[PDB]
Ligand binder design. Structure first.
Ligand SMILES: [Mg+2]
Ligand SMILES: [Mg+2]
Lengths: 204, 204
């Protein structure tokens, strides 16, 4: 529940990561090459919880998976998600199909995200892996933008089935404007800047 | 942001507070005498933030104050809120006007809530002060029920003025059903029970 108290180590990593990303961004914006993703539990009551695993960029959702009740993302499933995500990017993002742009990948450091096999796949796919700070959902567009917007809408839902969840998810992602996804990604520099100006603390 | 990690002290206080409240509740339910309250920041953009201070029971909102932009609740203002809250209870809750029931008061231990002057006023008013655990919004009906429901609705708002906030607040509190407030309060024992069964941890 209540807000994690950052320690010195944590605030130092945040501040320093934000400085590095912000000075890079000022040299040359890279925001349009960011693909980012995160997992979120969705709860339904049967006549239970599924994990939503979703990846997106400034043009919209690229790929997602709703995992079967109770089941979880471990190192092996995540590696398989990335391989599928890549197949979906190739189909939905011609810029990358044509390898005229390298993907910049923004995910958190959940353990399944840094297992040996996942690291290997990431190198093979050869996406640039952006550094991500400990305890920083305020710097993760999936959390501060996508799932923040989604959680509100989901509050009013009482899902009946795994497949209702899926139905609701399809409509919800589609009814969002292109410019909704773009704003989510393009808010990053403002947040990196707030984070530097707080010295790595959480911010307003 | 991300969820406070409870330490041993904290989980012990939660577990033990919940045991005490739950065995009392099983001996004789006292839930209908609970008046509870909390503060929440509401943000508006002028052509800024106000603190909502609100108190309620199972029949609805009793009293609230929206403080002027940036201003804060210190020991002296809180004492003055309680005196006003009491005037409002007397007007809106005849059971208590007629002193056939003692108020059970549920608030957190923010420092302004435990200043010397506030403690004195609480004794004078003679409300029973329920023990409240450190870092326990999951056990505070204002947080898990009232402000959880409100935050969603507020997400869609872009307030223009202190007085829009106030207008929205009046309508919002009034459009809630009686049974909405009742459920908020009457969910307590379930939560105390979850908290005991987690041994003082946060729960699902
Ligand atoms: Mg995550
Ligand atoms: Mg509080």
């Amino acid at each position: 529940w209540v807000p994690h108290e950052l320690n010195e180590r944590q605030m130092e990593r945040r501040k320093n990561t934000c400085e590095i990303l912000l000075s890079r961004y000022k040299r040359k914006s890279f925001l349009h090459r960011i693909v980012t993703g995160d997992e979120k539990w969705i709860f339904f009551v049967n006549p239970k919880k599924t994990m939503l695993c979703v990846w997106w960029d400034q043009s919209g959702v690229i790929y997602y998976e709703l995992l079967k009740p109770g089941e979880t993302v471990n190192a092996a499933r995540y590696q398989q998600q990335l391989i599928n995500l890549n197949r979906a990017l190739q189909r939905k993002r011609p810029e990358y199909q044509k390898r005229q742009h390298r993907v910049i990948f923004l995910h958190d450091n959940a353990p399944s995200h840094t297992a040996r096999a996942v690291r290997d796949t990431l190198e093979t796919l050869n996406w640039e892996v952006l550094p991500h700070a400990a305890y920083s959902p305020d710097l993760a567009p999936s959390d501060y933008h996508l799932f923040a917007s989604m959680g509100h809408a989901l509050a009013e839902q009482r899902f009946d089935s795994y497949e209702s969840v899926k139905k609701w998810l399809d409509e919800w992602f589609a009814a969002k404007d292109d410019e909704f996804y773009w704003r989510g990604i393009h808010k990053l520099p403002e947040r990196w800047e707030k984070c530097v100006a707080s010295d790595g603390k959480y911010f307003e």
